[PDB]
From a paper:
Many Type III TA systems are plasmid-encoded but we decided to investigate the chromosomally-encoded [name] system, from the human commensal [name] (CptINEr) as the first representative of the [name] family.
The best diffracting crystals (1 native and 2 SeMet) were isomorphous, and, following phasing through SAD, the final structure was solved to a resolution of 2.2 Å. Examination of the symmetry units reveals that each protein–RNA heterodimer formed a self-closing, heterotetrameric ring-shaped complex with a heterodimer from the neighbouring asymmetric unit. The heterotetrameric architecture is a major deviation from the heterohexameric complexes formed by the other structurally-defined Type III TA systems. The structural core of the [name] protein is similar to the structures of the three previously solved Type III toxins, being made up of a highly twisted antiparallel β-sheet. Each CptNEr protein binds two CptIEr RNAs, and the protein–RNA interfaces are considerable for both. The CptIEr RNA observed bound to CptNEr is a classic H-type pseudoknot of 45 nt, which is derived from the two genetic cptIEr repeats. While the Pectobacterium and Bacillus ToxI structures are very similar to each other, the fold of the CptIEr differs markedly from the ToxI paradigm, and is also structurally extremely unusual among known RNA pseudoknots notably in the structure of the loops.
Numbering used by the authors:
A (entry chain A), B (entry chain E): 1 to 155
The structure:
Amino acid sequence: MIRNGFYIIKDRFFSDMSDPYLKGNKKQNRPHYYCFEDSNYNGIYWMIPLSSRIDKYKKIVSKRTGKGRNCDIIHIVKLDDSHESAFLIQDMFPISDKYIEREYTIAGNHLRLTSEHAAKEIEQKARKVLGMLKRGIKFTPTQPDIQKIYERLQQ
Amino acid sequence: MIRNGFYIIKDRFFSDMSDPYLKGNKKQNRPHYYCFEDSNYNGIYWMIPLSSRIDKYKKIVSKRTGKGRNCDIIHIVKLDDSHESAFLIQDMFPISDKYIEREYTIAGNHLRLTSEHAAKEIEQKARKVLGMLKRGIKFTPTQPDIQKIYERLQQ
RNA sequence: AAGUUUACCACUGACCGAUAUGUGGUAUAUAAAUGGUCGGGUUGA
RNA sequence: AAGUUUACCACUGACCGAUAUGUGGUAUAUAAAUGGUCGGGUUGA
Ligand SMILES: [Ca+2]
Ligand SMILES: [Ca+2]
Ligand SMILES: [Ca+2]
Ligand SMILES: [Ca+2]
Ligand SMILES: [Ca+2]
Ligand SMILES: [Ca+2]
Ligand SMILES: [Ca+2]
Ligand SMILES: [Ca+2]
Ligand SMILES: [Ca+2]
Ligand SMILES: [Ca+2]
Ligand SMILES: [Ca+2]
């Protein structure tokens, strides 16, 4: 994987981890964003699932925004396919190389977040969210057990 | 000289160049800012004179700002002595090492523009102003002849 | 797909302090990314 | 101290064009610094 690219993840990942709170892979159709490599173990990569349910995710953003705060758990931006996507940073999770199926493409090119300023903002939000998750913060009552996944990946 | 430092220039410079439009050096009491070294000749340095006449220079800035444009010829910023200074980028000029008298000081330390973001903005404004001056632009009818000075410095 | 609880840790430039509505980090604090503001301070335009 | 006339050159990301109210550069354009918008285009949530 290359940083800021979008990818499809093998269903095998989801059946191996068996976590009912990960965003469903929709049979290898949900694009996932590769945010950054883990600092502590090489070969573990942090991914963020996307959703196109903008009406739903805008309301969640506006919960914070309407109180004068940034939303770190969701970030909505127009991708290079010219449509808006929600990055569910809240639901980010770790993965290893063997679980990656392929590049997510647009007309046979690799879709990726080419706008560096958007990538940078997303990366910051993700570091913050991951920091908070590691310290036991729960943004929803249905939060994936990324600690369990992370330990399983430690091969 | 070190980039972003303030300096006093020898009166000898001003009597040698005899340019009535350079900002008067007030008998070696006008601080001057060292912006950047000349690209074409080492040992030639571009300087910017300062003025504390903020009321006057604010009006000149607002001529452009009031039409929605940036002012590049004048930039006003609070220095580390906690007072506002006008950088008369319009009146910038070249100099060589032998015309520098000494560091401009605050309580025996070297006054300099430590706020990098301000230094960067000023450097950009200066590159633009110098570019325009080299192409014959005249911001005032009383503009120093920096070409003549620049040639004299070449020796 | 559904699901909707923002924590903690440091940092904020003449120099000496302080500080968040600013900066970044994620168990680390000689890091990273900021450089505003307030008090002291101050030859010089 | 007084003095108060903003030019030109390129650049604006799946890909192909275009563009300044955006980016930077100063005689250079395989540079630098930006990455919005419009038109085309588009398996997948
Ligand atoms: Ca794009
Ligand atoms: Ca379109
Ligand atoms: Ca300062
Ligand atoms: Ca003060
Ligand atoms: Ca510091
Ligand atoms: Ca301090
Ligand atoms: Ca403190
Ligand atoms: Ca450091
Ligand atoms: Ca480019
Ligand atoms: Ca283009
Ligand atoms: Ca063009």
